[PDB]
């Protein structure tokens, strides 16, 4: 082929052996997912989109998976992000304090991976995948991480934080994962406040993007679900994990 049926991405090499290597790994370091048998998970992963049109997938589609996922978070140490994913990471990995999705057993398995099925057989296809804009919304890839996202959302409690990338255009975008989903999946009842920390990129002396009209928009929404808002501006991301890693002393 020189066309490809889909314009995504195929599945990445070597998928079943990654994500069950992932799985044994985290099932390794975590001591909570001790009870997780690998080749199950594997199973219920591959039985949410092969065999299936993967313009036809559905949350319902990863309901096995998700059983055998189910891990407790701490609530109230759950950090969101938004496009920028790299510095949230980083930060994770000193605060071993607040986690990310891709923290959990379920993000861990999936981050960076692209994977499809093709209805008429049970073949993994590794020359393309649908993409979301081009092809359909409701391909393997789009699904999971809608579910996942959600569900993470609905677990956090008390102050949630959410890291924003403020070099973008819309610092807050109301079309992203973060603004479509998890926004709106936060449970008032429990959720006190979501706090943003709005990256900046390159920058002398920078503006405060706290009152960009994205943000303002997002205080709005936030607001009007009997959530309180909460702006920071992390002027050099770089000074700000050095504080992470050392801090008091210096300019911190
Ligand atoms: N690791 C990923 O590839 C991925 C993809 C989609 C959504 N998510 C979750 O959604 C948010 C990021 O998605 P957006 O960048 O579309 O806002 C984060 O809270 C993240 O945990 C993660």
């Not at 949410?48 to 140490?77: R, W």
């Not at 969101?80 to 990310?100: C, E, G, N, P, Y």
């Not at 960009?212 to 991301?237: A, G, M």
């Amino acid at each position: 082929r020189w066309r490809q049926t889909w314009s995504g991405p195929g599945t990445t090499k070597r998928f079943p052996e990654t994500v069950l290597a992932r799985c044994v790994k985290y099932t390794e370091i975590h001591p909570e997912m001790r009870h997780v048998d690998c080749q199950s998970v594997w199973d219920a992963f591959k039985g949410a989109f092969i065999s299936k049109h993967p313009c036809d997938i559905t949350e319902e589609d990863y309901q096995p998976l998700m059983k055998l996922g189910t891990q407790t978070v701490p609530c109230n140490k759950i950090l969101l992000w938004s496009r920028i994913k790299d510095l949230a990471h980083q930060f994770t990995q000193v605060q071993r304090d607040m986690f990310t999705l891709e923290d959990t057993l379920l993000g861990y398995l999936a981050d960076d991976l692209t994977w499809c099925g093709e209805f008429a057989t049970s073949k993994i296809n590794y020359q393309s995948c649908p993409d979301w804009r081009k092809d359909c919304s409701n391909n393997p890839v789009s699904v999971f991480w809608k579910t996942v996202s959600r569900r993470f959302a609905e677990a956090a409690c008390d102050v949630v934080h959410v890291m924003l990338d403020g070099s973008r255009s819309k610092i807050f975008d109301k079309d992203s994962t973060f603004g479509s989903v998890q926004v709106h999946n936060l449970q008032p009842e429990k959720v006190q406040t979501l706090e943003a920390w709005v990256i900046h990129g390159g920058r002398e002396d920078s503006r405060d993007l706290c009152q960009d009209p994205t943000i303002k928009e997002l205080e709005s929404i936030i607001s009007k679900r009997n959530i309180q808002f909460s702006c920071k501006n992390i002027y050099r991301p770089d000074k700000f994990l050095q504080c992470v890693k050392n801090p008091e002393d210096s300019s911190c």
